[PDB]
């Protein structure tokens, strides 16, 4: 027996034992999530423990099969995924120190509170109070105070921990046969072994830079329009040259511009459509929303849903008794068990989130036939892309009229189209430069181009030249302003959302192209079209067996990231913005200072 | 008299797939109403004999096997199939004459904590010829070194079935009762 054959009969035993231990870990986590109790915290913890022990003994037994002799691509991929040394390559004391620093980071971010003003009893937490006060506010002073206080209370206590964490992670990545931690994170978008479809981390960086260069005009026009609109409501605070204050932008970190609609509406006389009253008038319960979503999914061409999805999964809040958490998640236990955890009500947001989670559920049912180590999307932006394309298809006015949530006599005008396009743009195209800047800063900090003693000034410089927002007040180098974000302090990657948007617009364009739709792209609908469903399922069933450069090619005909469909989606909005800000200035100059 | 068909479908427990149980039902008057009266069947196929024409046919030996398998592995109980069951556990001849009856049993074969009392064979040196039993738990050597016990490149041939009531439909227990009809030159008694 050769090595390919030993690898094959070792990978089958892993598969069996692993599916059992993962079902037990995941059922234990659901029972905790649906019902919070110490027994439930205890069992979640014991099952997680047994799973981590299995994984490590199998990655210490899976080190005896070299990859230089394995020929099969799937076996090579599984062995590569199972041969990762991980954090175990570090020393025991160093590993313990890194784990403790990560734990204390999570604790300080989660339980961080600002209570200095007035009496100490005036305590404001992040989620209940800070986000609420940042979402809507009309006073400059309170927003500036909240921004500065949160930035201080985060950075002053988190910078040395971040420095130690960066040093330890860089050392671990270097010891893990890499260059730095940024290279380790970029190793996900890597294909090697198949001719014609090959990728590299530097290629990913170049592609991201090229796409941002191609997309910058639209963001420049949108930023100019937003600044012009904000000038009137907030006078004597923004210079026309550009560089709006970072704090005075809506969200606390300015990740999204969603809450700026109240100040940047094109036409206030025509309100956006809503069907909350229509849903509540026909006595629409929590079951009917999911029934309609399943009906749409089966009308597209995808299969139905199992009974266990209906009897086991819970879709409504259980009241004061048996408290739980409401975070919409599509659970996949693994042994034919698919569940959804979310509490729903009569709202458009829940109506769209039902389709969004059903997309993930359909993806899981599609790729459940693959082996255990190949049951995932091709990239991290593949699941969200499918979810958002289903959500986009489910929100068109034609679909709403067809299903029965709107009167048949309703008519659509160009003003409503412009309003919808601006609402979409404030969320999608307004969050790409921030993600790109943050990821570039993290990559440069990890790899080493950035001096240790020069961390804040260069961050503000990049924010000024790339994003186009200046600091409201000067910040000395002691601060650790980037660390205030949830993802950076909790060791998460950020390029996933950029990649997800770029993939999802291409997916939507390709899918509704095959449905024989004539007209604007933003009005495309996939209902009652089996060809598009079959084309989508052809890539859905693949899972992680094939490289993403081939799964992407199988649907859109191109094997690389593209920005042309994104620009095609926002073409009427681009024309309207070009026609609008012809009198005001376009672009920003970083010469402005407080 | 009556054939002992009731005691096969009404058994309190069913043997595992890797060690199935065969009973001869010769020397009795065939009725088949017992098998036609039971619970709805997830699958019901007969190759070679018409379902209705079973009353007037005279046979000398009627065999009745019984085991428990999963839901998506039921389709491997047929002549000319490839899989984990048809190769190492239970194989039917290419020339077959009988009925294959299966029905879901989730209420009786689910302990809510792992019903590990059902086993199947996943590793074997060679495939199984039709109607053969192999009950052995000897260590399977997948390497090039003699095996001194469980460890690297040495696996336990059997694999347990873990059944729970919350599983899907293809991972739920299914009780299978095939009825092989044997015709011989000896006078028929059934
Ligand atoms: C067997 O038959 C009895 C009565 O004939 C019935 O109550 C029972 O459900 C059947 N099945 C089992 C497994 O006992
Ligand atoms: C199973 O087969 C054995 C002989 O192999 C027989 O004695 C027994 O009655 C059969 N049934 C059960 C339930 O053991």
mmCIF file of C-alpha atoms in Angstrom, chain A residues 1 6 9-10 13 16 20 23-24 64-65 312 335-337 339, chain B residues 116 122-123 142 144 153 155-157 159-160 164 166-168 171:
data_model
loop_
_atom_site.group_PDB
_atom_site.id
_atom_site.type_symbol
_atom_site.label_atom_id
_atom_site.label_comp_id
_atom_site.label_asym_id
_atom_site.label_seq_id
_atom_site.Cartn_x
_atom_site.Cartn_y
_atom_site.Cartn_z
ATOM 1 C CA UNK A 1 0.000 0.000 0.000
ATOM 2 C CA UNK A 6 -2.952 5.072 3.756
ATOM 3 C CA UNK A 9 -8.340 5.065 4.966
ATOM 4 C CA UNK A 10 -7.150 7.523 7.661
ATOM 5 C CA UNK A 13 -12.076 7.276 10.096
ATOM 6 C CA UNK A 16 -16.897 9.426 10.993
ATOM 7 C CA UNK A 20 -20.347 12.566 15.742
ATOM 8 C CA UNK A 23 -23.062 17.112 16.370
ATOM 9 C CA UNK A 24 -22.672 16.685 20.102
ATOM 10 C CA UNK A 64 3.175 11.287 8.860
ATOM 11 C CA UNK A 65 1.831 11.633 5.289
ATOM 12 C CA UNK A 312 -36.987 21.566 16.035
ATOM 13 C CA UNK A 335 -26.329 14.963 10.546
ATOM 14 C CA UNK A 336 -29.228 16.177 8.444
ATOM 15 C CA UNK A 337 -30.215 18.682 11.147
ATOM 16 C CA UNK A 339 -32.181 24.871 12.333
ATOM 17 C CA UNK B 116 -24.409 2.728 19.936
ATOM 18 C CA UNK B 122 -16.278 -0.297 6.963
ATOM 19 C CA UNK B 123 -12.837 -1.886 6.432
ATOM 20 C CA UNK B 142 -3.524 -0.502 6.373
ATOM 21 C CA UNK B 144 3.346 -1.929 5.432
ATOM 22 C CA UNK B 153 -2.078 2.540 10.577
ATOM 23 C CA UNK B 155 -7.876 0.512 12.820
ATOM 24 C CA UNK B 156 -10.810 -1.315 14.367
ATOM 25 C CA UNK B 157 -12.790 -2.704 11.394
ATOM 26 C CA UNK B 159 -17.925 1.405 13.084
ATOM 27 C CA UNK B 160 -20.799 2.251 15.409
ATOM 28 C CA UNK B 164 -30.852 10.094 17.751
ATOM 29 C CA UNK B 166 -33.462 14.696 16.200
ATOM 30 C CA UNK B 167 -31.551 13.462 13.136
ATOM 31 C CA UNK B 168 -32.618 14.042 9.541
ATOM 32 C CA UNK B 171 -29.739 9.250 9.034
#
